[PDB]
Amino acid sequence: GDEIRGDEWLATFSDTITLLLTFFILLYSFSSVDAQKFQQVASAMQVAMT
Amino acid sequence: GDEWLATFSDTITLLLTFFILLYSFSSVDAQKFQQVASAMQVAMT
Amino acid sequence: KRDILTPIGFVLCFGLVLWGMASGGSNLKVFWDVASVFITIGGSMAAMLITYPMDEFKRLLIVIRQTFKDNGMSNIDVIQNFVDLSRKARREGLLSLEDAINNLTDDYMKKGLRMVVDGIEPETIREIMELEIDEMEKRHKSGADMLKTWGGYAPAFGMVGTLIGLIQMLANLTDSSTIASGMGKALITTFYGSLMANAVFNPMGANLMFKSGVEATTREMVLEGVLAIQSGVNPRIMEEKLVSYLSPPERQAYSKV
Amino acid sequence: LTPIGFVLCFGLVLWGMASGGSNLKVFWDVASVFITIGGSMAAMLITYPMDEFKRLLIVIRQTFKDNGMSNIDVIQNFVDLSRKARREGLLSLEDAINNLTDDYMKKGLRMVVDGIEPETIREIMELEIDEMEKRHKSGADMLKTWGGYAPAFGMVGTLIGLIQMLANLTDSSTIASGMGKALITTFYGSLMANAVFNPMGANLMFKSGVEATTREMVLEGVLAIQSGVNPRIMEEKLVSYLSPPERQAYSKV
Amino acid sequence: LTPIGFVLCFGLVLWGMASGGSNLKVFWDVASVFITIGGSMAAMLITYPMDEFKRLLIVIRQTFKDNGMSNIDVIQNFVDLSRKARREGLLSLEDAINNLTDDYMKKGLRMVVDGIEPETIREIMELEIDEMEKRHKSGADMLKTWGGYAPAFGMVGTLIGLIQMLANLTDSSTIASGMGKALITTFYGSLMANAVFNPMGANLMFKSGVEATTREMVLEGVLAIQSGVNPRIMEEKLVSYLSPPERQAYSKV
Amino acid sequence: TPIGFVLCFGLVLWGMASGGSNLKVFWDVASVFITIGGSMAAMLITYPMDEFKRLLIVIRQTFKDNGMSNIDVIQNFVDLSRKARREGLLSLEDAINNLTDDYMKKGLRMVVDGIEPETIREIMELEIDEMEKRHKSGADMLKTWGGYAPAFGMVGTLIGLIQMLANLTDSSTIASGMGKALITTFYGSLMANAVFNPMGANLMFKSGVEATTREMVLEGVLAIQSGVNPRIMEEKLVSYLSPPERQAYSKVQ
Amino acid sequence: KRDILTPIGFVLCFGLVLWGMASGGSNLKVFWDVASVFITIGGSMAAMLITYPMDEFKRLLIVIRQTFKDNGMSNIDVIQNFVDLSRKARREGLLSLEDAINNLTDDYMKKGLRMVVDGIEPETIREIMELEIDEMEKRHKSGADMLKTWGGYAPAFGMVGTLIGLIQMLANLTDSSTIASGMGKALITTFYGSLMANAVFNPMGANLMFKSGVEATTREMVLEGVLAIQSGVNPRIMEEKLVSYLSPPERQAYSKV
Amino acid sequence: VFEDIITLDDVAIQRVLREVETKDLALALKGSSEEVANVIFRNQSKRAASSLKEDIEFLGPVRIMDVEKAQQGIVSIIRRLDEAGEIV
Amino acid sequence: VFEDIITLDDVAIQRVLREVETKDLALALKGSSEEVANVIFRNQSKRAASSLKEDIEFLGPVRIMDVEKAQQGIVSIIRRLDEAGEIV
Amino acid sequence: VFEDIITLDDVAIQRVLREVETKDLALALKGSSEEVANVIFRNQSKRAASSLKEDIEFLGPVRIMDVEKAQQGIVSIIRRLDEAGEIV
């Protein structure tokens, strides 16, 4: 009953993305976001979602 | 009961979506980095 | 059999999800995204049409819908019906039962009893009626397998919408509207895919399998009641073997009549 | 329907891709296509030599266009043949057998017309069902294997993209757009798996079960012709294969 | 099974959470518990009928007492019963049967002293074993299903939190706190799956095998008493059911 | 044929070279030891030396042992059934020895030597089972290595990340160390998806193809002993052929 | 003869991981933190105590330890011991082996031989000896399944540690000490969990089943050797039947004598 | 033979019919009268009678001697259970 | 005798033809004239007749007695089938 | 003829004390003298002798003339091995 499941890639993808997220959170910890650039994105998502 | 790990990698990718976007609008403070780098050594070493 | 866990489970499941969505002051429109509907709901449904032809897709949907109906009468009534049939069949013969076996709504008791009245040998009746049970279980398994197939397709297409959204977001970092549209696509495609899989498709297909097994047991004891009518026995050995098929929490219920 | 499901699947996904006004060229990358499609294709050549791959491709293509007779029409032909066999014997069915369009009903009934005992007729016909199921399973297994390879080589290409961009970076903005190009190959592998390979593999599995039910139905009824059962008894046993929607459709015909 | 693994599991994980001078209130959210536990419980109600839950409660209640009969005790009394069945006949095995508390030894032993065929006894006792394994397997499957639902509905709550926060960002400094708050439901789902549901489901599966071995041991001893084997024969036949730690403990007593 | 391997690594190598970055960013001698050596060392713990020797034998069989065409199997058996009908059963010795296919001379030799047909099936079904067991064991070893290689690549990636955090000095080299640590994961996924997993699936598919041919040969051998008509022998053995193969066989026979 | 693959594998596996850990001239202390030990190693071990009671968990630990402490005589030495015993059996009688049997080290061999000396029926000895093999195989499978259960628990609790680290980092992303503590928790919990699963637990469980199958084959050959003493055969028919169980590398290994 | 069935009561004629199979009943009914078939096809099921309607036609040519033995066999079974609860 | 198979009806011959083994039928057809085989060829399917064509031709010169014993098997099958429904 | 066990060699007694039941042998030894018991105990395994001792201290009071049935059966065991590898 050797079922063929195409999820062997999933373990590598999940761990690779997980440490990529953990590594990008580190960069954001000691970074300063541009307030004007963020304000454009924040206001645009209110329009898009609502 | 492990079909949800597909959704976990989906959600972690979703979590990474915001931070890659935030990182594009960001620059290194060069002083908060020293605080994080110094405390990095203290926590592990 | 007046099952209440499934209606209650659905109300609490979506009621808790809806309560979570309407938590704080969030307006419910933020959880609606047409692009997301096309990607995960539309994409997984279209993948379902690749797996299942539309003619067979309609058939399995009908099979799923019929299994969740109230059906006919309970395991208590069929034993009462068979015992009443045994009294009438043991006095007026196997015939004169045509009126009694024609107003029934089982369509499986009717099939077996009509063969009994016609005078078909028990071996032929048993093999025909056991073939009905085997093929009905195959139909129910096919419907439940179809729900489980959709339960895997929807989260798979929810992840596709995540990649679509992130690729869109990262390729248009100078346009805030495209950033907002891409990120809304990625977040809501996963939300739709996880809701369909975990709140509907996966639980419901497993629910179909439990209902199929209960229905198979009901048909297994209807066959015994049919075969015992043909091999005429008094309505005390009939009620002796029919209650043996009852569930442990059901046998004592019949004892109180 | 599978041919329209393919059109619907890519059409609905593409509409969602273009819904937010973004240009669709951001999803197009020739290098990503060759890494994901070519890499998974090359891996399939490792699993299957390019002689069994062709045969399995033909096996998949054969099931896509075959249009057999309906199960309801199987009842009618068997009921008609059983009624005719009870009037003029089995040899009168020879002209009717050659008018069939199954090659499985024909094979079983031709053994019935000749003197072939029911024991060997059954095991020959069940052998055809078992080998038909095995052939469909092998074709479905080939499609499911490709449904795993394509995201696997999409992940390999994503690592290639991530490593390449993280080595040569100029600013935080060019890094963010680097992840987008790196994830295109993963998007290709996920799309190919979920829209083509996996649904086609499950389609073959579903078709195998449907044809197996029809063939068990045909076998149980080929043996009834030569056993001389009553046409009503044959119909009663035969109709215990159809869905209740099919049972009423056969009643009115 | 004592509930010390649950205290250790949550206690040791809680110590790690609070280790690096981290405040634990960032991990507490009352609404997150309802989304994760309540959402997965409502899915379990859809998945399983009422009788399955009642059967699950029975086996789970049993596994927390386990005040049964030791395997060394089973052979010790079976060997003693062999001597009396040899010294004083089989009919004398009536008071010793009713003075034990096993509820499975007695049923098999009473069959032996009532003149029932060895094949008949094996049929009844082995069917009872299969019933016990089926009850445990279905109970373990229910807990494993809940172990898949809890992380699934924890991620649904995380997605809801991410969607809600993104609709009202407005700060650029509350994003990380909002993402951390939304992640709590997923953490609850993983914690409940890995510390409660999955280990309890594996506990039921392991307990089923232990009881199956004990019942197979009793069936062998019951059949040995019926055939009047030598007390030495049944001893070495039943010793081949004990671990080497148990064999040295049994010989020293 | 290593055509799949050349295409697999050629397309992957082309993908790395497709980007403007030099191929040296993908090369890391230390990463090879962590991924290849780490997963190989776990395989040494997992498998004894006997399994490795059996795996090497079954790998060499794949590239060398071709097999026999199913069209030739039916063509030979039909003629052998025909010849054994005109002449006696003890007249195929010339044809038996001239068969260029193992397991078929051996199967036919115990037919002319008068051993019971049921024992012939058991002897030659066990030969099928050991062939299947040998291939499954080798396939499981390759699939286990296909799981070990990305797991140890992830371990090497984690080691690189942990080392980078400890020695955090320059913020402009954080992403460079990010991509350098990812080389181990790239090696693990590349070795799993281009070597181990496709080769393990290759053994599983080759086992099924062989098992079908052996069962077809066993079916023909048993039909020769219990003398059946050549029409029945052909009809029984045609079931093993695909619909495309039946047309090819029909022209010759 | 001697199993040297798994000690080589352990030295190579943990030597290479240690070599990578110290590759950059960094302190090995950076890979140690108690929080990750408490979450992954402590959490998965405590989850193992939920699955396995301490009495049974310790019992399976001894079974695992005893399986890898094989110091018994090799398969060739057992065969050479049986032909030596068979020579004395047909020269001085079966009762003369009482002194030789009590000096044996294999408890399985003595158990079968003592029954033969006492005159237990041949089909009773085979039934008992087969039950010895079957129950020993079941015990080994329980020990290997215990290791595989731990091989899934440890990575699962390493992902819980990742969730703990991420939430801790996200809640206090302006502390720079919570960031470092959360950063280490997320990465090192995964590091511990993957090492336990892929370097220790999963390879050990599979290794255990291979040793169980080899030991079962040795017992099956000891049973035939024991049963041939009872029947009575010169050390020429005994030698040919015993070596059929020998592995192909072992078949001609003893061919010199 | 096969004449005193009309006098036989309606309850008991159903009882004997459950013993004699379709093949025996149809063989004896070829050499009978029209009103006997009406008697037979009124204590049988509505669709069971239709089964015997076509069976008798399907036989076609047949030796006459088979009719009496089937009729006698149907007569014989009635006598051998004539002492049961059914009226003589 | 085996020479009486010609006078039988096509329906009766067809039933016994698929019952008699092809080897038995071939063994009993050497002692009969060509006209006998015509009533056998027509009352069989094309595949069954084709198998009979090669079986009679590739059997070899057989003893006269062996033909005699084969005809008894065929001629006795119709003997019990005389009252089973076959009309002679 | 009983009491010939003490006259045969140890190997012959060892073989015949390998298939007799431990109950009837105990039944055939309760009335025998110590010299007959001595030749039985030392030509048997330690476990077998302990089993015999347990079977002679818990036999209970039994009547005469049934021991001779065990004794004749024990002697008959020697008779059936007289035509085998065993010698007298």
| Structure determined via | cryo-EM
Task: Report how far residue G190's alpha carbon sits from residue F155's, in angstroms, rounded to the nearest whole number.
Answer: 9
Task: Report how far residue E203's alpha carbon sits from residue F128's, in angstroms, rounded to the nearest whole number.
Answer: 38
The reply to whether C196 falls in a domain is yes
**CB-CB under 8 Å, G187 with F45:** no
Task: Report how far residue D182's alpha carbon sits from residue B34's, in angstroms, rounded to the nearest whole number.
Answer: 30
| Contact present, F162 and B44 (Cβ < 8 Å) | yes
The reply to whether I85 falls in a domain is no
Task: Report how far residue E115's alpha carbon sits from residue E226's, in angstroms, rounded to the nearest whole number.
Answer: 9
Q: Is C24 left (phi over 0), alpha (psi -120 to 50) or beta?
A: left
| Chain A residue with minimum CA distance to B23 | A28
- State whether G76 and G173 are in the same domain: yes
Going by C-alpha positions, the residue among C16, D18, G176, C184 that lies closest to residue E169 is C184
Task: Report how far residue C89's alpha carbon sits from residue C82's, in angstroms, rounded to the nearest whole number.
Answer: 10
The reply to whether A37 falls in a domain is yes
Tell whether B11 lies on the interface with G, counting CB pairs under 8 A. no
Chains adjacent to C (≥3 CB pairs closer than 8 angstroms) = A, B, D, E, H
Using a CB-CB cut-off of 8 Å, the residues of chain C touching D20 are 35, 168, 177-178, 181-182, 185
Tally of domains within chain A: 1
Parent domain of C49: 34-255
Tally of domains within chain J: 1
Residue I9 backbone phi and psi in degrees, to 5 = -75, 160
| Contact present, F26 and D163 (Cβ < 8 Å) | yes
The residue behind tokens 């067809």 is I14
**CB-CB under 8 Å, G176 with A29:** yes
How far off is chain B from F173, nearest CA to CA, in Å?
12
> Bridge partners of A33?
B26
Task: Report how far residue B43's alpha carbon sits from residue C3's, in angstroms, rounded to the nearest whole number.
Answer: 57
The reply to whether I88 falls in a domain is no
H34: domain CATH number is 1.10.220.30
CA count, 13 A, side-chain hemisphere, C246: 20
Using a CB-CB cut-off of 8 Å, the residues of chain J touching G92 are 11
How far lies C156's CA from each of C39, C152, C161, D190, F137, in Å? Answer: 10, 6, 9, 8, 32
| Contact present, G147 and G51 (Cβ < 8 Å) | no
- Are chains E and C touching, using the cut-off of 8 Å on CB pairs and a minimum of 3 such pairs? yes
- State whether G25 and G141 are in the same domain: no
Helix (H) / strand (E) containing B28: strand B26-28
DSSP string, E170-214: --SSSHHHHHHHHTHHHHHHHHHIIIIIHHHHHHHHHHHHHHHHH
**Contacts of J3-6 spanning 24+ positions with Cβ under 8 A:** J3/J36, J4/J75, J4/J78, J5/J36, J5/J39, J5/J40, J5/J74, J6/J35, J6/J36, J6/J39
- Are chains C and H touching, using the cut-off of 8 Å on CB pairs and a minimum of 3 such pairs? yes
Going by C-alpha positions, the residue among G193, B2, G87 that lies closest to residue E149 is B2
Task: Report how far residue I46's alpha carbon sits from residue I53's, in angstroms, rounded to the nearest whole number.
Answer: 10
Task: Report how far residue F95's alpha carbon sits from residue F84's, in angstroms, rounded to the nearest whole number.
Answer: 11
Surface-to-core class of residue G16, CB atoms within 10 Å of its CB (0-12 exposed, 13-18 middle, 19+ buried): buried
Instruction: Report the amino acid identity of residue D2.
Output: T
Using a CB-CB cut-off of 8 Å, the residues of chain A touching C184 are 45, 48-49
Helices G122-171 and G54-67, interaxial angle, to 10°? 110
Using a CB-CB cut-off of 8 Å, the residues of chain B touching C183 are 17-18, 21
In this complex, how many residue pairs, one in chain A and one in chain C, have their CB atoms less than 8 Å apart? 26
**CB-CB under 8 Å, F154 with A15:** yes
How far apart are the two ends of chain I, measured CA to CA in Å? 14
The reply to whether E18 falls in a domain is no
Using a CB-CB cut-off of 8 Å, the residues of chain A touching C29 are 49-50
Chains adjacent to G (≥3 CB pairs closer than 8 angstroms) = A, B, E, F, J
The reply to whether H30 falls in a domain is yes
Of A15, A22, A28, the CB nearest to G183: A22
Of D55, D128, D155, the CB nearest to F239: D128
DSSP string, A30-48: TEEE-HHHHHHHHHHHHHH
The reply to whether E79 falls in a domain is no
How many beta carbons lie within 10 A of that of residue C21, not counting itself?
18
Of I11, I19, I46, the CB nearest to D115: I19
The SS3 call for residue D79 is: helix
Tell whether A14 lies on the interface with F, counting CB pairs under 8 A. no
The SS3 call for residue I82 is: coil
**CB-CB under 8 Å, G36 with E15:** no
| Contact present, C210 and C68 (Cβ < 8 Å) | no
Using a CB-CB cut-off of 8 Å, the residues of chain F touching B28 are 171
Tokens in use for G32? 């140690």
Residue B28 backbone phi and psi in degrees, to 5 = -70, 130
Instruction: Report the amino acid identity of residue G81.
Output: N
Using a CB-CB cut-off of 8 Å, the residues of chain F touching B23 are none
| Chain C residue with minimum CA distance to A7 | C156
Surface-to-core class of residue G244, CB atoms within 10 Å of its CB (0-12 exposed, 13-18 middle, 19+ buried): exposed
The residue behind tokens 């913020």 is F171
How many beta carbons lie within 10 A of that of residue C11, not counting itself?
12
Going by C-alpha positions, the residue among D106, A22, D21 that lies closest to residue C177 is D21
Task: Report how far residue D154's alpha carbon sits from residue D161's, in angstroms, rounded to the nearest whole number.
Answer: 10
Task: Report how far residue F248's alpha carbon sits from residue G2's, in angstroms, rounded to the nearest whole number.
Answer: 56
- State whether G96 and G55 are in the same domain: yes
> Bridge partners of B26?
A33
Cβ-based neighbours of F114, under 8 Å, separated by 6 or more: none
Interface probe for H, chosen from D79, D84, D92, D230 (most Cβ of H below 10 Å), is: D230
**CB-CB under 8 Å, C98 with H46:** yes
**CB-CB under 8 Å, C95 with H45:** yes
Q: Classify residue G137 by its DSSP letter.
A: H
Dihedral angle, C-alpha G184, G185, G187, G193, nearest 10 °: 140
Cβ-based neighbours of H7, under 8 Å, separated by 6 or more: none
How many beta carbons lie within 10 A of that of residue D14, not counting itself?
15
Task: Report how far residue A25's alpha carbon sits from residue D163's, in angstroms, rounded to the nearest whole number.
Answer: 19
For D85-136, give the secondary structure using H, E and C. Answer: HHHHCHHHHHHHHHCCCCCCHHHHHHHHHCCCCHHHHHHHHHHHHHHHHHHH
Cβ-based neighbours of D182, under 8 Å, separated by 6 or more: D157, D158, D160, D161, D162, D164, D165
Parent domain of J27: 10-81
**CB-CB under 8 Å, J17 with G119:** yes
Tally of domains within chain F: 1
| Contact present, J22 and E232 (Cβ < 8 Å) | no
Going by C-alpha positions, the residue among E89, E86, E121, E80 that lies closest to residue E222 is E121
**CB-CB under 8 Å, B23 with A24:** yes
The reply to whether C2 falls in a domain is no
Task: Report how far residue G146's alpha carbon sits from residue G208's, in angstroms, rounded to the nearest whole number.
Answer: 11
Surface-to-core class of residue F170, CB atoms within 10 Å of its CB (0-12 exposed, 13-18 middle, 19+ buried): exposed
Instruction: Report the amino acid identity of residue I9.
Output: D
**CB-CB under 8 Å, C30 with A47:** no
Using a CB-CB cut-off of 8 Å, the residues of chain G touching B44 are 29-30, 33, 180, 184
| Contact present, D28 and F209 (Cβ < 8 Å) | no
| Contact present, D197 and D150 (Cβ < 8 Å) | yes
The residue behind tokens 């085998």 is J84
How far off is chain C from D211, nearest CA to CA, in Å?
13
The SS3 call for residue D32 is: helix
The SS3 call for residue G7 is: helix
The SS3 call for residue G94 is: helix
User: F183-218 burial, b for 16+ CB within 10 Å, e for fewer?
Assistant: bbbbbbbbbbbbbbbbbbbbbbbbbeebbbbbbbbb
The reply to whether D44 falls in a domain is yes
| Contact present, E124 and E111 (Cβ < 8 Å) | yes
Task: Report how far residue G21's alpha carbon sits from residue F33's, in angstroms, rounded to the nearest whole number.
Answer: 12
| Contact present, A9 and D189 (Cβ < 8 Å) | yes
Using a CB-CB cut-off of 8 Å, the residues of chain E touching G115 are 236
How far off is chain C from H85, nearest CA to CA, in Å?
12
**CB-CB under 8 Å, C184 with A48:** yes
Task: Report how far residue F110's alpha carbon sits from residue F108's, in angstroms, rounded to the nearest whole number.
Answer: 6
| Contact present, F124 and F214 (Cβ < 8 Å) | yes
Using a CB-CB cut-off of 8 Å, the residues of chain B touching A8 are none
Interface probe for C, chosen from H10, H16, H45, H87 (most Cβ of C below 10 Å), is: H45
How far lies H40's CA from each of B1, D2, D224, H9, H15, in Å? Answer: 65, 57, 28, 12, 12
| Chain C residue with minimum CA distance to D7 | C46
In this complex, how many residue pairs, one in chain C and one in chain D, have their CB atoms less than 8 Å apart? 167
The reply to whether A31 falls in a domain is yes
The reply to whether G125 falls in a domain is yes
**CB-CB under 8 Å, A30 with B29:** yes
Interface probe for A, chosen from D22, D155, D165 (most Cβ of A below 10 Å), is: D155
Task: Report how far residue C158's alpha carbon sits from residue C164's, in angstroms, rounded to the nearest whole number.
Answer: 10
Helices (H), chain E: 4-17, 30-33, 39-47, 50-63, 71-87, 95-98, 105-112, 118-167, 175-182, 184-192, 198-226, 231-239, 244-251
The residue behind tokens 């148990």 is E246
Tell whether A43 lies on the interface with C, counting CB pairs under 8 A. yes
Helices (H), chain G: 5-21, 34-36, 42-51, 54-67, 75-92, 98-102, 107-118, 122-171, 178-195, 202-231, 237-242, 248-251
Residue I66 backbone phi and psi in degrees, to 5 = -65, -35
The reply to whether E15 falls in a domain is no
- State whether G52 and G67 are in the same domain: yes
Using a CB-CB cut-off of 8 Å, the residues of chain J touching E87 are 58
| Chain C residue with minimum CA distance to E51 | C249
Instruction: Report the amino acid identity of residue E90.
Output: L
Tell whether G184 lies on the interface with F, counting CB pairs under 8 A. yes
**CB-CB under 8 Å, D172 with B24:** yes
The reply to whether H88 falls in a domain is no
Of A8, A12, A27, the CB nearest to F185: A12
Helix (H) / strand (E) containing C116: helix C109-118
